[PDB]
Write a protein that binds this ligand. Sequence first.
Ligand SMILES: Nc1ncnc2c1ncn2[C@@H]1O[C@H](COP(=O)(O)OP(=O)(O)OP(=O)(O)O)[C@@H](O)[C@H]1O
Ligand SMILES: Nc1ncnc2c1ncn2[C@@H]1O[C@H](COP(=O)(O)OP(=O)(O)OP(=O)(O)O)[C@@H](O)[C@H]1O
Lengths: 576, 336, 542
Amino acid sequence: INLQAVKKKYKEFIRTFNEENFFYKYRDTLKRNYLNGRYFLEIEMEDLVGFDETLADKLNKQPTEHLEIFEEAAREVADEITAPRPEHEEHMHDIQILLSSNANPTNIRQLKSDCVSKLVKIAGIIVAASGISAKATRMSYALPRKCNPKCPLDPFFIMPDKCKCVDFQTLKLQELPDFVPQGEIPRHLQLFCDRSLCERVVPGNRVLIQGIYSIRKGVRAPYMRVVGITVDSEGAGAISRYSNITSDEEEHFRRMAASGDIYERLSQSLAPSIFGSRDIKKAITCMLFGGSRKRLPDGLCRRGDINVLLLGDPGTAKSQLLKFVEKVPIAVYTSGKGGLTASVMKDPQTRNFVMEGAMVLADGGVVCIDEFDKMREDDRVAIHEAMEQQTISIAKAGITTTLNSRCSVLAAANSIFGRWDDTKGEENIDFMPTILSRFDMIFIVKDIHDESRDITLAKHIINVHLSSNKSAPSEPAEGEISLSTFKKYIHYCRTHCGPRLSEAAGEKLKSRYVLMRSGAGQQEKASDKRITVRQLEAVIRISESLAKIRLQPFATDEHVNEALRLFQVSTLDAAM
Amino acid sequence: DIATIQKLSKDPRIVERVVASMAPSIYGHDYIKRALALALFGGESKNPGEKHKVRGDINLLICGDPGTAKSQFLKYTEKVAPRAVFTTGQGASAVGLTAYVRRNPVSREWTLEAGALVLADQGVCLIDEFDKMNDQDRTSIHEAMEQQSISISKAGIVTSLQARCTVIAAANPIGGRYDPSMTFSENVNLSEPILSRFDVLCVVKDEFDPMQDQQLAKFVVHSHMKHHEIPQDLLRQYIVYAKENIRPKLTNIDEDKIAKMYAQLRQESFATGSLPITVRHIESVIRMSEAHARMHLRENVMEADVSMAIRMMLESFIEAQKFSVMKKMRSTFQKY
Amino acid sequence: LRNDFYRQLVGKRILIVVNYDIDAICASRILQALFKYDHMLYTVVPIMGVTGLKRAYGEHQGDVKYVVLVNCGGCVDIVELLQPSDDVTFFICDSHRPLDVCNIYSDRQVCILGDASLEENIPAFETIFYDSEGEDSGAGESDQEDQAPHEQRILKQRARRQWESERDRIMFEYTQFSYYGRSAALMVFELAWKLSKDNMDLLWWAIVGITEQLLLGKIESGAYTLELEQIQSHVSRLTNKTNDQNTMSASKITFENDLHLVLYRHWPVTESMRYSRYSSCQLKLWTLRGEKRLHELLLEMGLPLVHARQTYGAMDLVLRKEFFSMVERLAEKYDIADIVYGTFTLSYGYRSRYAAADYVYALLAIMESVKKHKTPEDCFLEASDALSRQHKQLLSAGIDQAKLLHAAVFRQVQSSLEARQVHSAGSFFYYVLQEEHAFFSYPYALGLLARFLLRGHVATSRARQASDLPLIASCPLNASEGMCLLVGIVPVREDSPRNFFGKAFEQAAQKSGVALLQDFFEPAVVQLRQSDLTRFLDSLTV
Ligand SMILES: Nc1ncnc2c1ncn2[C@@H]1O[C@H](COP(=O)(O)OP(=O)(O)OP(=O)(O)O)[C@@H](O)[C@H]1O
Ligand SMILES: Nc1ncnc2c1ncn2[C@@H]1O[C@H](COP(=O)(O)OP(=O)(O)OP(=O)(O)O)[C@@H](O)[C@H]1O
């Protein structure tokens, strides 16, 4: 029945939730949502078993009705508490509910006819979703014949001064990469969202989802919506924009910050299976942290982030490292074969020139690629541009919407003949220097021989490659632990501090770069044959990154001797 | 008639019964065919925590000579193994037949694909005429081998996808037939940063003896007397049982000695033909040992299969070095 | 009996609790609460070993009067161990009963809790210190030259004849077998029950105390099908509310006949039918076939497969209510008989309804032998700070940790078995192990290791000739630079015939003797050097 539910059960349910400690309610939560305009509420799905043993097993079967008996109970229990006296219910207001659980996730490949008009739980991934048009509830579907001398046959004028308005967003879902796409490609699905959950999910994230598989019109169509979404914890599966982090988390964080044995701890963090290569690694982690995007009263929106390089003989674990940098806030990865054009296609509906837009998708994330080498030049010029001004322009048809995106970039490579070029002269790149110039890092890889190193890289790998070893003994090391922390920690540290230099750093850095350029020019003159602003404006970013690390705003050049001794590697690499 | 596995599979001599139904085709050539028989037998993910997918499918080659009956080696694999693919040399540009295509219901859904490795995962790729392909495609195929994955762009999409399968090739070199035991990097224009991704080598070197010419001639003439110890009926099923269900491991046994042998490898081989001395081919040894014990359904292993693997590699890596074919021989009679 | 002595207990004391146990914490937290009732401050103690005890008394080397130790006693003639003991009040209450009587007599500084249907050692002291040979008691203890109020020296002959002919029973004591006896704090419940204490949570704590070693396979209950009268008679007869029990907090606790398969409640099924011994071994699942016979039972129950990989709590209703309503009757006929046992359950409130033993399998998993060097005692202080109704964020972590251990257990068993590491090595069976785990460092988990291999191999590869033979096992500690731990364990299904190995390993110690230790009050344990066992094993065969 419609009323025996609202008559007592839902209406007293919220009223009855009782554990001493005088918290265990959804009443106070409802009011402290109400006060601040939120208009929502969350529940589990296995608390009702703590109230009864039937209603839940009715919630699954006829959800669409129960989830409005809830709304009626919600407002009729909440407007009593709106009343300070009968004189401050200015007017009532509508709410939306959320429910959650921890039961079990599913996969798209089992969404079939039996799992229809029924609650579920899944786990997928996102690509993109629509804009925000509209939808409403009532105003003053079939609109029948009668009129209300004659007035004939359906003369109905909508009075939209007297209509209403809620939201509408149409979310999307693709599967995960480990549920038999092997002999296939991945399918996907489109969705639906209602009132307060637009701008709750940007594309490119891992989801938990609570939804329902229902139709619109025997070949008729699918779709799904949210029935109280939540999110993922792949380490920190969804910790990408919002904050349910608590003072405990800030406390643990900043207590880690002042701990002055964190950076040399973090130079051993990425590889619980690889040996060595530490000076290569001291600034693969700073690349995430980023420096400062300082605009000024003139134009100079100077380059914020940093950029990476590496090229070397195979056999030194390039691929795993870059896959790991993808793994550990948000990022994507391709390598070669992909663009120079952007996406001016045309929805066959309405025949216009829309802009679908994927350096877009790293506007706070980053990007990593291998093979700038083995992808030719028809698609390098748009990326020549993007990574120096970030004002990604468009001028194709009658649109000049030079949008922008702030992304960094990481580059692997492969040179011909190994260190054949790297011993002799000008075959470092085969193509051009202005994407070798326009970067920051300059880190070459070699695989030189020595018997001690040989035997050690022998047994070091065996204990790694023996029987999925690292259950016990990885975290028992000092502090080389928990990428999940690194995700949430970065998404703090980048989004708070506004650091910049001291006085004493400036003169020392100027003199040092002066000596660097002078040494380059002397190599020009000491060989009778043949230094940007970019090098200064990049190495400053490592000071930026370090001060980002320890959370000190102002940093020193003695703090940055490490950074300039990292750049020393670049200098003595391109020594010739 | 389903436990025929355990009617024979626990006897000792049946290690070499890999070969009696490997390819009863061609008189000589036992080594390379046993090696193929291994590389067709293996598979493991052994994914550790969070890092990556390691490897369970392996590169082969036989860049020998135009004449040795090698084409024909491979068709038994295609007609015997579970999953494989149709191609020769001169495929696409590796871009692929209608791969990049932005998504609308104009032009009737505008088909999408990226090559063929996507289309046979946990199967095998048949290729021939490696040295006779447009370099900028044999370029592109250079990602699957260890990373076992693709990643694309240049559409309205940036979807990604795994490429987990096995490579095998039996091509031809430059220079007509074949040099003598003179080196390899001189003998064919396959560059350094690829043949390292390749691990297990073989070469069909031929020269003239009258006796074996008589023997194989008798064998061939008898092979066209078909007028009018295993069958193929089973090792299909043996390999399915072995590759699906059993999931072996390793244990601490003598694994320091591999270090000394890899060290001898790299120190005695510096500048002669010594570029392809890397770490995957010493992934391969212990992995091949696991494949050997898979061929036993032993599920663990002792020194026997490890010494067998090290033996095979002594063999091959001596084969592809100088007319002084005995350097590692004299250096290795103490292990042998 | 201390309805009379307890009125001595007001002044200062020390409450010791010897080496870690669930009997320990259960029997002691109750006494903490008792002694903060009549306004006394007191002391609870961790023991890591008997050296920790002697230094503890050294650390408590005062004249503190009402000193207490519980669940110990068989270490020394404790008068000899304990010099400053002059007239100080000692208390034992230990269930490891087979103790010498040198500790019992000298009725100043001990409390004889001697009460049993076994009058087996009555003259047991009348010849050891009372008589002697080769030394005025007027006995062999005194002179033996025909001076003690067939030959002049047959005095000693009759003396040693009686001595040794009744060492037939002295060697029966402490030199044939060991055990435990009775409860840890059920006596203490009935003690306190005279003082009008209706603490339902105390009943739960003692239920935890019993259901540890109510494990009729691990350690015997005996009283069990008698305590289905007794404990109910404690609780059921006295009902404070006949009509008012539909209440939120701590509803008056109950009893039901349920099972001892692991963690039926909080996990899915088809992994939790897999980790116990009695369900697994009697269905043989580490081989492929066992999944098939399991599956053909799941047919007869006809549960869904998809459901059998959902948490039991997470299932739909009717199956998850009818589950045990089915399983009890159509499992008796398919190789497994004896998982159903007698236990309790209750909820605090609405969250979920905890299982009366499911703490102990988190407690055993709170033994974190971590390299921080502090954590055993912190594990104790966490454990006794866990059993309440209050601290509950941590019990879930305990359950998680427990299950991941229990599913790591099997991971070694398949690894060890089908390589045939079951070394016979003569009269008994023998096992050896190579490197360290944080899982199975300490020996509780080690006995749990042994008690899956054992049933598996010894039940399934043999005739009935050797199904009754005992067990040993290595266990290395890369912790302490190489000591090569060992534990002794019994043969199959003989509940009362328990360990020979109260001392039996000491045979080889008597022959050669090499750096052996017995630091634990636990007898069923030893500790060695890194590799000095092989010749000691050749000795330790017979
Ligand atoms: N220094 C190292 N320590 C441990 N393992 C290593 C090391 N280098 C490589 N490996 C192993 O080899 C693999 C890394 O090879 P990787 O894919 O980086 O080669 P690559 O850089 O892709 O070669 P190319 O650049 O020619 O494609 C990893 O799976 C790892 O197991
Ligand atoms: N030793 C041999 N044993 C059996 N058959 C042989 C032998 N030599 C040649 N043949 C036959 O000759 C034919 C040619 O096969 P073969 O593999 O020698 O050509 P190929 O070397 O692959 O040429 P390419 O490498 O250019 O494709 C086959 O049908 C094969 O049966």
